[PDB]
Amino acid sequence: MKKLLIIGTGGTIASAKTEQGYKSVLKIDEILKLAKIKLENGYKIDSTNIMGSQLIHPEDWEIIAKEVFKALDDYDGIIITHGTDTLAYTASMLSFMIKNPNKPIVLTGSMLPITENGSDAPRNIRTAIKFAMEDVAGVFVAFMDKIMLGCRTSKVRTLGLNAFMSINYPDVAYVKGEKILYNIPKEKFQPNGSPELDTKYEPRVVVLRVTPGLGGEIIDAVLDAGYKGIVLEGYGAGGLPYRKSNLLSKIKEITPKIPVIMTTQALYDGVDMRKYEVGRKALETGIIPAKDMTKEATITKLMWALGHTKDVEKIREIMHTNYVNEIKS
Amino acid sequence: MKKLLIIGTGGTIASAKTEQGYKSVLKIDEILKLAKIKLENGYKIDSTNIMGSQLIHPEDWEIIAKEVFKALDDYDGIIITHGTDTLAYTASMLSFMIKNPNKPIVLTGSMLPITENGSDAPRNIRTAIKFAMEDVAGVFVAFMDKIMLGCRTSKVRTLGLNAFMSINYPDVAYVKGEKILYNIPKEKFQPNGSPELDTKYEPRVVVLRVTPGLGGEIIDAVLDAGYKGIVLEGYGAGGLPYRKSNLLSKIKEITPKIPVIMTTQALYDGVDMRKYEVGRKALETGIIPAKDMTKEATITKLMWALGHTKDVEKIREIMHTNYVNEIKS
């Protein structure tokens, strides 16, 4: 009946405790063996390893997108095991690089190595397999029995097993044993159009936390260092100091040439740069609101957008296009 | 019986909706009047305004600490109204600038202006007054009926009224009408020693989010721009790329001269740089773990520490000293 591909990429899920700490040591065949995954029953799993890796690099996104893209032809469902710390960047970036995928692409990981007592790895793989067997299409994350839209996922903690949340967006579904309870209607994830691959990206995006003290001298430094986009983890007021501070005036000097995106240091509820006068002053300088996007969506989307054009009005239109429900319309 | 001082500083709590957006317009006397606060019954409230402000600047911390410090002599309790976006930076910084305060110092704010329907401002002020009437000492935040240790508070969302959480640390208490339920024993917040004022700080700390793509060229740029400390919002693996990446090797070149602190982009559970080999490699470069500290504690503590010395071993010892339960021992 159904054919699944599981792609290994590294991560805690590929790791074992050593005398030098956790170390990425397992290929996907050993993960599947150590997590006691059934390779059949209404399906057949094939497995492959892309390329000691804990962390994804932007180059790896192009590699993974090409392999996933070629595989849509031969598989009903595609699972990617991945390090938790950068899984949400990968999930978001594939959501822009693979247009109209016509099969489920499901990323997962673990907080514990398989071989540690109480590991979450077997359960997360099993969840991902179950959802990958669904007649749906898009890029999803499977974690702690939840299915979440890839471009809306963030890692919220470093120890607790319920480590990924859907930010400012509903979960897709919840998997209890063999039952899938759709939180968003299944009919909403049907394939539309033919898949396309677009791997253009510019990686030199720098993300800053807006703090008291942060001066315009940083904006000078990041331009001197060659960076092409700036993400700010700003305030819910949505604005910057324009008094005892050159930050807003130094940004206003560069917004015609460099996209400056305003997201939040706060996790939940998004940025509204219109509610406060201080926000409206930040907008008036040409700072581009990230609205309800996650950090990981904001960042990967801007890298992808800069790969297409350096025209800041065109970047604004790309960032505010709702491609795959990464952002409100 | 008891004397309370309420200090105004600006914020949403001081704001009103105008045709140009929310605007800071109210002095503390008008806030108290519009929120219908009782200025007596077992107490007397005095009020004062420090110095159009939504956002605190590091300079304001010294001003507020001097005024709060002088006021310990004449008041049983001190309340500060403050903008929510930078309240947690202020609460943390006062926790290092005011040693062994012998009275409750309680910061609060609101998500809604007083004059907006359903405002949280009256309730937050009332909570802060109630806790300020307690025979305890330290720096606390009052929000949505909770009392939280100041140096453990973060703003987690931009719209929901329950906007502040206690991070990796229990709440101090919960206030239901006239009842205070102590979550940590009251006896644990008794005054010890005589209050001291220490307002030394270095503001040029830059906070970066660790992303895929982030190169060592940023470390060069921030040194050229004169910054004296770097906070990284890193990964739970606790490490950096040392492969297809010069980030870790450029940081290893500067850690003898510049403190580089590793905290998390994730909100909850802290950094453990020993669990993973990649973390141990980051430690071996002399990156200083922030452990369980909040971003706002990490950042203000480093600014305060740099105000005392530029010796990176002495900064490490300061950062890992548990002064006021900002960090685990």
Author numbering:
A (entry chain A), B (entry chain A): 1 to 51, 54 to 331
What do the study authors state?
L-ASNase exerts its anticancer activity by hydrolyzing L-asparagine (L-Asn) in the bloodstream to L-aspartic acid and ammonia.
The mesophilic combination of highly conserved residues involved in catalysis and substrate-enzyme interaction was restored in TsAI by the double mutation D54G/T56Q (TsAID54G/T56Q) that resulted in a two-fold increase in activity. The point mutation T56Q led to the formation of a hydrogen bond between Q56 and S15 side chains in TsAID54G/T56Q. At the same time, the D54G mutation destroyed the network of hydrogen bonds. Together, this led to a change in the conformation of this loop that was additionally fixed by the formation of a water-mediated hydrogen bond between the S55 and D62 side chains. Moreover, the part of this loop (residues 52 and 53) has no electron density, confirming the increased mobility of this region.
